[PDB]
Design a protein around this ligand. Structure first.
Ligand SMILES: Nc1ncnc2c1ncn2[C@@H]1O[C@H](COP(=O)(O)OP(=O)(O)O)[C@@H](O)[C@H]1O
Ligand SMILES: [Mg+2]
Ligand SMILES: [Zn+2]
Lengths: 224, 202
């Protein structure tokens, strides 16, 4: 399953400093937790490195439940828990994960580069021929990861006074894909995210930022 | 730059010269014309010099091959493969320099009389003081400097006094007074002029 679910109540009860650090800088903390989970699993199972080589930690029962209408710039870069109804869901797309490039001037295969969620990885020179010139994805030596966008809106029962429901995009990666379905009512834990490539710099209006939730844990609300 | 000593030369050969590198504190230790001992290591330094032929060369082991329009041929191909000439020359890297034949066994270093005396050992200055007190030192120096030469006592004495020399001076007007004597030997063939000169040289 390559994914370990950690209860936030248990983490806080055992060690409260990590739990208090967790929602303030979850990108770094979840990176650390993934490395430590890999170590503990490989210690327990030596032969599991040829299965996944990456363990994802999903934080559960986070107490910071904010409804979609209440996310602000205060919440940016923080682990939030929200609930809502999945309204749309792309197909599982393959996203570059450890991308190898071809120098299409000398055909050298430029070593694996990590693909962050924030920006396109663009190589500099070719290590061999030192060309800045065009590269291309080596799609045979690249490893990919599963990607899926969902739109989640507030449950119509929650939106109440006479006002419209609010929706956020969420990104499910590599285990979380196909865990939701248009119509599902879910609990979403993720990092409220600001900084990838959407900032409206095109003078098409005010310098506002598009935000997304990097889903970290998805919990449906139903029988199975 | 140093060069091979005369006693090391094989037949028909010019003395080899290698350049030695002196570092932080050894850095001013060898003066031109000094017989010196260099302790250190013989190293190779990459030197840029060819057209004897294409020689040994280094290139990447990665098997790249330029595409059409970018064929790894010519200068572009040599640049792409990281090709460079492995040409080297030998250089000595000296950690330490010492005179080959030290004058005083004690310690080298402004050169005052006391500095020279302190530079000596105890037995060395015993001997220096002894011969300074030597009555008949003039004759003794003439005989011990030119043992194999018979007669020509005046030439021995004059060459000795040349070796000791006078006192240079400077006049208040700036005139410089020569303080070291010059000697010219004029003579018939085979009267040992060249021998006096060789004695003094050695
Ligand atoms: N007292 C002396 N008078 C003359 N010749 C001498 C004396 N003692 C030695 N010789 C020998 O005479 C030889 C000729 O000496 P050299 O100096 O070569 O000649 P020249 O004086 O013409 O340069 C030398 O080999 C030297 O050993
Ligand atoms: Mg002669
Ligand atoms: Zn290249």
């Amino acid at each position: 399953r390559e994914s370990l679910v950690v209860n936030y109540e248990d983490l806080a009860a055992r060690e409260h400093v990590l739990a208090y650090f967790l929602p303030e800088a979850p990108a770094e903390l979840l990176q650390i937790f993934d490395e430590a989970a890999l170590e503990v699993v490989l210690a327990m199972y030596p032969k599991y490195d040829r299965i996944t080589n990456h363990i994802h930690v999903r934080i559960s029962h986070l107490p910071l439940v904010e409804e979609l209408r209440s996310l602000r710039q205060l919440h940016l870069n923080q682990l939030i828990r929200t609930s809502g109804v999945v309204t749309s869901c792309t197909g599982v797309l393959p996203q570059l994960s450890m991308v190898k490039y071809n120098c299409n001037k000398c055909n050298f295969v430029l070593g694996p580069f990590c693909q962050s969620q924030n920006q396109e990885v663009k190589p500099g020179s070719c290590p061999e021929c030192q060309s800045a010139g065009p590269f291309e994805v080596n799609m045979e030596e690249t490893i990919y990861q599963n990607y899926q966008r969902i739109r989640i809106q507030e449950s119509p029962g929650k939106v109440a006074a006479g006002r419209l429901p609010r929706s956020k995009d969420a990104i499910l990666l590599a285990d979380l894909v196909d865990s939701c379905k248009p119509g599902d009512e879910i609990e979403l834990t993720g990092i409220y995210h600001n900084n990838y490539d959407g900032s409206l710099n095109t003078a098409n209006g005010f310098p506002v930022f598009a935000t997304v939730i990097l889903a970290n844990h998805v919990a449906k609300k139903d029988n199975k | 730059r140093i060069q091979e000593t005369q006693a090391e030369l094989p037949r028909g050969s010019i003395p080899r010269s290698l350049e030695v590198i002196l570092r932080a504190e050894a850095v001013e230790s060898a003066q031109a014309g000094d017989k010196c001992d260099f302790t250190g290591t013989l190293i190779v330094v990459p030197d840029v010099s060819k057209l004897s032929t294409p020689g040994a060369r280094a290139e990447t082991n990665s098997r790249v091959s330029g595409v059409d329009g970018y064929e790894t041929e010519g200068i572009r191909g040599l640049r792409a493969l990281g090709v460079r000439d492995l040409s080297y020359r030998l250089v000595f890297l000296a950690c330490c320099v010492a005179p080959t034949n030290p004058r005083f066994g004690g310690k080298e270093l402004e050169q005052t009389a006391e500095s020279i005396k302190n530079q000596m050992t105890v037995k060395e200055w015993e001997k220096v003081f002894e011969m300074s007190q030597d009555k008949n030192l003039y004759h003794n120096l003439c005989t011990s400097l030119f043992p194999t030469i018979h007669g020509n006592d005046e030439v021995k004495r004059g060459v000795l006094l040349m070796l000791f020399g006078g006192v240079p001076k400077t006049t208040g007007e700036g005139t410089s007074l020569r303080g070291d004597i010059n000697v010219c030997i004029v003579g018939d063939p085979s009267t040992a002029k060249s021998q006096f000169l060789k004695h003094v040289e050695e």
